[PDB]
Amino acid sequence: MLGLKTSIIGRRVIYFQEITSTNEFAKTSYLEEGTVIVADKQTMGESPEGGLWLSIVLSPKKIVFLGAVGVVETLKEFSIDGRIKWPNDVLVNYKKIAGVLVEGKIVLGIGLNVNNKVPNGATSMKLELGSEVPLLSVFRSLITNLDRLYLNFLKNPMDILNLVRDNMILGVRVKILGDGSFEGIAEDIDDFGRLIIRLDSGEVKKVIYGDVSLRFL
Amino acid sequence: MLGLKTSIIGRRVIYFQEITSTNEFAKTSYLEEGTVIVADKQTMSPEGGLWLSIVLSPKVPQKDLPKIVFLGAVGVVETLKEFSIDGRIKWPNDVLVNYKKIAGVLVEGKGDKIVLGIGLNVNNKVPNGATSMKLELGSEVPLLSVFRSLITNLDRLYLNFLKNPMDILNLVRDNMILGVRVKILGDGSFEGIAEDIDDFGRLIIRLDSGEVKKVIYSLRFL
């Protein structure tokens, strides 16, 4: 009855009034590629009612970037200026509005603050527009964008990188936290999606996601 | 993201762009009670209609299990009324509007699980003689709004059924086509007046001779 017209993402959609975690359900269950798991709230991500909490089962033959860019495109459709914080968050005026979590079957998880209450420092679509936003409209928009991005990714895996570059926060100082830490200017992402940092000394470091965290100064 | 507020029916919803049969999927898959299977179209039910199945496992007496079909029929009648359409039940599983079929209910089973299937013509094209919400109202009807309405009504009817299983019978009675002549097709076919339904949900027919017959389960209006 939803009438989705996507090719892969959204072929099937499993909705829950509540779930522990959409990513955990997607990882654990036997599901076909393109199936979307969505819940009004997650008890063990709590991801409160009002937000868009979903996970997508993928089996591709840079995935976190698909999610981030999809969210940015949807936000722009609603006239909200979302910018990517490498490599998995989307911020509006430096306040977190969405987060992407990929686990590998590959599960692409996305959490977007829409009408829900949010933690300090974070923001939501409702807070940005000053009014409630139809959650289903955001879902439809995002699924359409993600399906297009994914289908093209299967063809041209490199294309997503330029979309990330055009929508990511760069040219500012950041602190990279891993086993040890360093600071420098986030210059760009390379052909592998690695964050290129120029340290004050001139040294160039390439950051690979996994067990590292980025903080803005 | 649907924000359903129902207690049992609709706790989970599995949507398909296309499926062979929502009833078949519901029967062959392990699904918690209240799970709704819905599809844009069934291949074995064109786009525009509401095609769904609900998984139920009612802990009620064996004798009440045959009443599940009525929950579906009454739920459809209630939803239609919300949209200003007067539907009437053609015993035991169809809903007609001015004698034109607008919905059908099919109850199947597998194990202690009961699958309540409902097909409602909303915006889809329909066979001559049949009708749809769109044809009755003269404009496209938001399919999701119909879904929300129906699921809400079914959840309420079901919760009460689990406690007061006899209640559904009076609702059916007040919303069914009675007092008219009908013919029961098949072996031992006969005709008579459809008088009412009894405490088992059987259709009570008064033949011209005065004989009374009770139908458990094809009927034609004469």
Q: Residues 6 or more apart from A20 whose CB is under 8 A from it?
A: A42, A43, A44
- Nearest by CB to A15, which of B2, B17, B52? B2
**Residue in B5, B13, B143 nearest the CB of A15:** B13
- From A23's Cα to the closest Cα of chain B, the distance in A is 16
Instruction: Work out the burial of residue B174: count CB atoms within 10 Å of its CB; fewer than 13 is exposed, 13-18 middle, 19 or more buried.
Output: exposed
Rounded CA gap, B157 and B162, in Å?
9
B187 CB burial (10 A radius; 0-12, 13-18, 19+): exposed
Least Cα separation, residue A39 to chain B (angstroms): 6
Amino acid letter, residue A119: P
Strands across the sheet containing A173-178: A204-207, A195-198, A180-189, A173-178, A213-216
As a whole number of angstroms, the distance between CA A170 and CA A197 comes to 10
**A150-175: b (≥16 Cβ within 10 Å) or e:** beebeeeeeebbebbeebbbbeeebe
CA distance A73 to chain B (A): 19
The approach used to solve this structure was: X-ray
C-alpha angle A40-A107-A86 in degrees, rounded to nearest 5: 90
A195 to chain B, minimum CA–CA distance in Å? 34
| Cα separation, A171 vs A168, whole angstroms | 10
* DSSP-derived pairing of the beta strands A95-103 and A36-39: unpaired
**In B, which residues are within 8 Å of A54 by CB distance?**
1
Q: Helix (H, G, I), strand (E, B), or coil: what is residue B33?
A: coil
Comparing CA positions, the residue from A77, A84, A89 lying closest to residue A166 is A84
Q: Does A20 touch chain B (CB under 8 A)?
A: no
Geometric angle at alpha carbon B182, from B180 and B186, rounded to 5°: 170
d(CA A90, CA A68): 7
Contact B81, B87 (CB under 8 A): yes
Q: Tell whether B120 lies on the interface with A, counting CB pairs under 8 A.
A: no
Q: How many CB pairs under 8 A join A and B?
A: 67
Q: How far apart are CA A128 and CA B84, in angstroms?
A: 39
Q: Are B3 and A54 an interchain contact pair (Cβ–Cβ within 8 Å)? A: no
> Nearest residue on chain B to A39, judged by CA atoms?
B1
Residue A182 backbone dihedrals phi, psi, to 5 degrees: -150, 160
Contact A15 B16 (CB under 8 A): no
Quote the tokens at residue B92.
Answer: 């035991």
With the C-alpha atoms ordered B141, B143, B149, B150, is the resulting torsion angle positive or negative?
positive
Q: Report residue B193 as tokens.
A: 């007046």
Question: Distance between CA atoms of A214 and B28, rounded to whole angstroms?
Answer: 47
Let me know how long chain B is: 222
Strand A213-216 and strand A173-178: the pairing is antiparallel
Structure token pair of residue A53? 């909490």
Domains and CATH numbers, chain B: 1-177 (3.30.930.10), 178-222 (2.30.30.100)
Chain B residues with CB under 8 Å of A3 CB are: 40, 47, 143
Among B1, B12, B39, beta carbon nearest to A139? B1
